[PDB]
Amino acid sequence: MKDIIVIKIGGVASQQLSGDFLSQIKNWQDAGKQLVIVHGGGFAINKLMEENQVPVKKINGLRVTSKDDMVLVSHALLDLVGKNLQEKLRQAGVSCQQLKSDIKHVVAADYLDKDTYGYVGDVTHINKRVIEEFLENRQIPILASLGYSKEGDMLNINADYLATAVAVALAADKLILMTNVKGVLENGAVLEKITSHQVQEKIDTAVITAGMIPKIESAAKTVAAGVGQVLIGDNLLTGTLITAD
Ligand SMILES: Nc1ncnc2c1ncn2[C@@H]1O[C@H](COP(=O)(O)OP(=O)(O)O)[C@@H](O)[C@H]1O
Ligand SMILES: CC(=O)N[C@H](CCC(=O)O)C(=O)O
Ligand SMILES: [Mg+2]
């Protein structure tokens, strides 16, 4: 126990944060726990694309993103999701800060496959030293799912991918992938537990589809690298538990 938890918050999930959620965060912070928050915003980016007349195309659960598209992506993530997260937490007495210009000094990335996906990135390195300044200061850093190429270009990163990189870089005790379903569902009920060795065969039988594909792959990659537990569900405490074994 390093006493470190990474919380990743999905698009819908960030717009419905409960009283239980807000108290649990404040109580962990008051008990000395070190907390880092990562968030996405697919539902918001989709809305914005419509309102601005661009076509949503995804491939393998990843959004095809042109350079013009990135203006839309960064606006929805920073101004339409991230600012609300920071305001709800501060109003509840949690000490925290949205990264904006600090993003380029923390998350390095490269193009996943330019010809297929455009400006979609894969994380290449996390600079721990600047996340550590916030934590040493008892303040929770809030990170949108964005990174920067070696040449300085902003890239769109699937939020689950960013959460794995962050949890692994800090050697976290636990990662929570909080979303808008109660667990990973199979045959009409929530699965209580799954090990990393069983994930591939549920993506092969297509039990798991769409956005739950990058979610469950990130969970498996995290425990495989030594993080003790990953939770997938709609809250901080109950849902599906994933372990290396
Ligand atoms: N086996 C499954 N169990 C649960 N959800 C699934 C499954 N297969 C596909 N999904 C879909 O994955 C979605 C969650 O991923 P996503 O839509 O990207 O949410 P988030 O914004 O939290 O990342 C669920 O809302 C559900 O529609
Ligand atoms: C929707 C969307 O563009 N997703 C991301 C980033 C946001 C999120 O994960 O919620 C992506 O495909 O790369
Ligand atoms: Mg998603």
From Swiss-Prot:
It comes from the Bacteria. It is found in: Cytoplasm. It catalyses: N-acetyl-L-glutamate + ATP = N-acetyl-L-glutamyl 5-phosphate + ADP. One of its GO terms (molecular function) is ATP binding. It is an enzyme of class 2 (transferase). Catalyzes the ATP-dependent phosphorylation of N-acetyl-L-glutamate. This is Acetylglutamate kinase. The lineage of its organism: Bacteria, Bacillati, Bacillota, Bacilli, Lactobacillales. The gene is argB.
